Amino acid sequence: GRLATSPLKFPGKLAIDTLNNRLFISDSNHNRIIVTDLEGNFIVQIGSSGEEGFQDGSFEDAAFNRPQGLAYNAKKNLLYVADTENHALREIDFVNERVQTLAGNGTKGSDYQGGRKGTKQLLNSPWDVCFEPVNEKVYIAMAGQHQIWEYSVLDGITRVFSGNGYERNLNGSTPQTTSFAQPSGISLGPDLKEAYIADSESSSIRALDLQTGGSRLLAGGDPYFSENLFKFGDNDGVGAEVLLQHPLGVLCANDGQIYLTDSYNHKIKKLDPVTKRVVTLAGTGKAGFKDGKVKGAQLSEPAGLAITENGRLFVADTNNSLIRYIDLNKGEDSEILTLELKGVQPPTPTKIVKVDSVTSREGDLNLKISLPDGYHFSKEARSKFVVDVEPENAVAIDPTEGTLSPEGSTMLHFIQSSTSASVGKISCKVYYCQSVQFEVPFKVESELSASPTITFT
Ligand code: NA
């Protein structure tokens, strides 16, 4: 059946180019973007090896790491990518067939304000993107920090747009009097005045004001206890009668109506943002795979949506690893069907290790390199390391070079020289019977000593 033959693995998100009839698939756990026509015929992929990585360049060289949201720039023929586990915003240029990084730098940030340019601005688990084509802004659902961010296409400034960073369903009128709760989907309204948000961990749909940074609650969740993350269930109705569970995807159609994936209830739902009425569109609520009449069909953790001008709604049916679609024009005779992918192959494939940032002024790095079963480190070729700090002298790292222990381990003492951020690079030549570079971000946020573990197998 369709499940056994799918070349996808947990596709999370979709975008569409309705002018040139292209579907963009975030094949998330294959670390690649697939481009097909609207009938599922393969056109091109970016990330054909399927390997996790963080690499700019040609379509042959580029690498992603569990990417999620996509947004298409019709004016420039570019695809924006929320490259979640690289904490980066990427750009796929179809004119020149190149990938480049717009913002973020591969390391998870803890910057709740931003305002830096391009790759000097760190991000935190960006999950979804949408492109506002008049003011040329990419809005980012920054799931890791419970915020919405704004990337300025014309100058690269990347900044917080809304949300104080606390996880709650709080709908104030200014960016610092709003909060989100794992926002994982974002879609612009027809007038480009609001963005609709899938606020996954409050189990609600919200509307963000693109002029003020304030937000309002449309349906789902607890309108009276902002801290309540347990107001979930599966109930159609109006406003506060509505229960959802962990919606990951949201889409605003040209007529202003909202489609959403009520992900943990295995349903597609329709929200009228004017009346706040939510009705089930497709799915019984039981996890599964069944095509046909929409009310009797089954999905499994659907998470992304895209729509054609003619009313064909595509769904990334994530846990089934399938793309499905519904023709909305059919009304109550609507059916959900599976996009049969054609010509889409499964993936056919110095190591870099991004390390979690070190937050203590002083401490020790516990470096351990593991081997597979059967292998052991060489004897007449001890594995040696060398240490460099990206701004020289920014961190004093006491053994700047040496040999690894018989277990492939070593301990390095460090102290940061100031209050600014830096990067330490530990380059290792390991002989077993490879070349691995650990990239360690450093920034001072505590005066207590830390002792992180740095690992590679
Ligand atoms: Na999507």
UniProtKB/Swiss-Prot annotation:
NHL repeats lie at residues 7-39, 53-89, 115-154, 244-274, 296-329. One of its GO terms (cellular component) is chloroplast. The keyword Signal does not apply. It comes from the Eukaryota. It is found in: Plastid, Chloroplast thylakoid membrane. One of its GO terms (molecular function) is hydrolase activity. Residues 2-457 are lumenal. Disruption phenotype: High light intensity-dependent and irreversible nonphotochemical quenching (NPQ) due to a decrease in chlorophyll excited-state lifetime. Keywords: Acetylation, Chloroplast, Disulfide bond, Hydrolase, Magnesium, Membrane, Metal-binding, Plastid, Repeat, Thylakoid, Transit peptide, Transmembrane, Transmembrane helix. One of its GO terms (biological process) is nonphotochemical quenching. Required to maintain light harvesting efficiency, especially during nonphotochemical quenching (NPQ) recovery, via the regulation of chlorophyll excited-state lifetime probably by preventing the formation of a slowly reversible form of antenna quenching. In the N-terminal section; belongs to the HAD-like hydrolase superfamily. In the C-terminal section; belongs to the thioredoxin family. This is Protein SUPPRESSOR OF QUENCHING 1, chloroplastic. It comes from Arabidopsis thaliana (Mouse-ear cress). The gene is SOQ1. The chain holds residues 560 to 1038 of 1055 of the full protein.
